[PDB]
Amino acid sequence: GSHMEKLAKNKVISIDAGRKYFTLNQLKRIVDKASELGYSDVHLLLGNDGLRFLLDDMTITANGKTYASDDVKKAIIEGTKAYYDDPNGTALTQAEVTELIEYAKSKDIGLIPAINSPGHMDAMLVAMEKLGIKNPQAHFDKVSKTTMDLKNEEAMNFVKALIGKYMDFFAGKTKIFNFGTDQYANDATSAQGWYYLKWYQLYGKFAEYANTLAAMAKERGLQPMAFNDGFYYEDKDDVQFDKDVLISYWSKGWWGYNLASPQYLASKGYKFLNTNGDWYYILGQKPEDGGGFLKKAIENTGKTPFNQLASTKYPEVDLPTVGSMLSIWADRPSAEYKEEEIFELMTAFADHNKDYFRANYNALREELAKIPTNLSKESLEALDAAKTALNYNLNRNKQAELDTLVANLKAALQGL
Numbered sequence: 001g002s003h004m005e006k007l008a009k010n011k012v013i014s015i016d017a018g019r020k021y022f023t024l025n026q027l028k029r030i031v032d033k034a035s036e037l038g039y040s041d042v043h044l045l046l047g048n049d050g051l052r053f054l055l056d057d058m059t060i061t062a063n064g065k066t067y068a069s070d071d072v073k074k075a076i077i078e079g080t081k082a083y084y085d086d087p088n089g090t091a092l093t094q095a096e097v098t099e100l101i102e103y104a105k106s107k108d109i110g111l112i113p114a115i116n117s118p119g120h121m122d123a124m125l126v127a128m129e130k131l132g133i134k135n136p137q138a139h140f141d142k143v144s145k146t147t148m149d150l151k152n153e154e155a156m157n158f159v160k161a162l163i164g165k166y167m168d169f170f171a172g173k174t175k176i177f178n179f180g181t182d183q184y185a186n187d188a189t190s191a192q193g194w195y196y197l198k199w200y201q202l203y204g205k206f207a208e209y210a211n212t213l214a215a216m217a218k219e220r221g222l223q224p225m226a227f228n229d230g231f232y233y234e235d236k237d238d239v240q241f242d243k244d245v246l247i248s249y250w251s252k253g254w255w256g257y258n259l260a261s262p263q264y265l266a267s268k269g270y271k272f273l274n275t276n277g278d279w280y281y282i283l284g285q286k287p288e289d290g291g292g293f294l295k296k297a298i299e300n301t302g303k304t305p306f307n308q309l310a311s312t313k314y315p316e317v318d319l320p321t322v323g324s325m326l327s328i329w330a331d332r333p334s335a336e337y338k339e340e341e342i343f344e345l346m347t348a349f350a351d352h353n354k355d356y357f358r359a360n361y362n363a364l365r366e367e368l369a370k371i372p373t374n375l376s377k378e379s380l381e382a383l384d385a386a387k388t389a390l391n392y393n394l395n396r397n398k399q400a401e402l403d404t405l406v407a408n409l410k411a412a413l414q415g416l
């Protein structure tokens with residue numbers, strides 16, 4: 001059935017935890033709401049401008065030398081603080097992120113980590129400076145502060161190795177790994193990075209870098225994901241890209257930022273994670289700033305259909321997507337993270353799409369945790385009968401249907 005097909009789609013909440021620090025227990029609560037509302041995954045940006053995740057062993061092997069774990073950690077902490085010294089914290093630990101993956105798993109919530117490059121790597125650039133790698137930054141109208149110079153082999157080799165060590169960690173723990181590749185040297189090019197790459201004949205060198213990260217992910221058993229920006233820019237295929245990359249499509253761009261359409265990308269075989277920019281919320285964004293403020297995001301949650309990719313009209317244009325992603329951003333990371341706002345937008349998105357989202361199984365899990373190894377024939381058959389009649393396939397339209405079933409389990413649990 002199509003009932004099966006909709007629930008099998010991805011419902012993802014994206015948290016910008018690269019720019020701004022989130023506590024283990026803050027993220028823990030997001031995945032709780034995600035589970036309750038009927039989401040399937042939490043997308044967690046850990047490298048996005050700042051680098052807010054440190055492994056237990058951060059020993060990097062690149063350029064014929066090795067970088068001591070302690071030297072690497074110290075470098076990264078300084079870089080993340082150079083981007084933005086968050087008073088709430090710097091980086092999540094291995095032990096914390098492991099806990100979140102196992103916690104999310106217990107609630108049928110997948111995790112999708114994101115470590116961003118070659119753009120959005122302010123922290124890594126500084127970390128590499130501190131580590132002995134000179135001038136890792138891209139250079140156009142000015143020296144970039146966000147983007148790696150694709151011609152710096154020493155910088156490229158380090159980042160490749162560093163992303164490899166993160167990937168080694170998520171191998172076996174998560175299905176997907178997002179490497180981003182969005183908005184190249186936007187600070188240094190007046191938001192025309194792709195135009196500057198093609199102008200300086202470095203776009204092929206960009207695809208070569210992205211294809212590497214795609215292959216690195218595959219060989220480690222991770223589904224590679226990237227944003228759409230750099231893929232077949234301006235609908236040109238003079239430079240080819242890896243076709244197995246799950247495209248998180250957010251926008252077709254604006255004047256002078258001529259991104260590939262979803263149609264052109266789909267014609268080349270790409271499957272989409274619908275990351276429509278309409279559903280965007282930037283922390284502390286006000287209706288007067290324009291763009292992605294809360295009440296527009298909550299409004300577009302109903303105005304923009306679930307399967308509708310940015311720059312297209314549904315169902316007139318019906319392109320294949322594995323599901324949808326709702327994205328929360330921290331562009332000014334000093335803005336207050338108000339949990340209520342995110343929970344409200346998450347709810348709205350779920351409420352407008354009750355046939356895609358799952359019912360709330362949290363009550364059921366607590367009631368099933370109350371049944372013992374054994375505690376009387378006839379009363380034990382009612383316990384088996386209620387356990388049989390449980391339906392794990394119900395969507396958000398059927399909470400009542402589910403509640404009745406859990407109630408029958410609660411009643412049957414009190415026999416003898």
Ligand SMILES: CC(=O)N[C@@H]1[C@@H](O)[C@H](O[C@@H]2O[C@H](CO)[C@@H](O[C@@H]3O[C@H](CO)[C@@H](O)[C@H](O)[C@H]3NC(C)=O)[C@H](O[C@H]3O[C@H](CO)[C@@H](O)[C@H](O)[C@@H]3O[C@@H]3O[C@H](CO)[C@@H](O)[C@H](O)[C@H]3NC(C)=O)[C@@H]2O)[C@@H](CO)O[C@H]1O
Binds near residue numbers: 252253254278279329
């Ligand atoms: C004047 C004119 O006609 N055109 C150009 C301007 O539009 C352009 O300024 C841009 O404006 C667009 C809006 O049209 C905006 O993109 C939008 O972002 C909204 C949420 O921020 C979202 O609701 C909306 O769907 C989306 N696109 C639309 C409506 O088409 C631009 O914002 C981008 O890009 C700038 C780069 O200049 C970044 O600073 C922003 O952060 C944002 O990038 C992404 O968005 C999120 C949330 O903001 C970030 O956190 C992410 O890091 C980032 N990437 C991803 C993958 O999400 C932009 O402001 C100007 C720019 O010069 O040019 C005019 O010619």
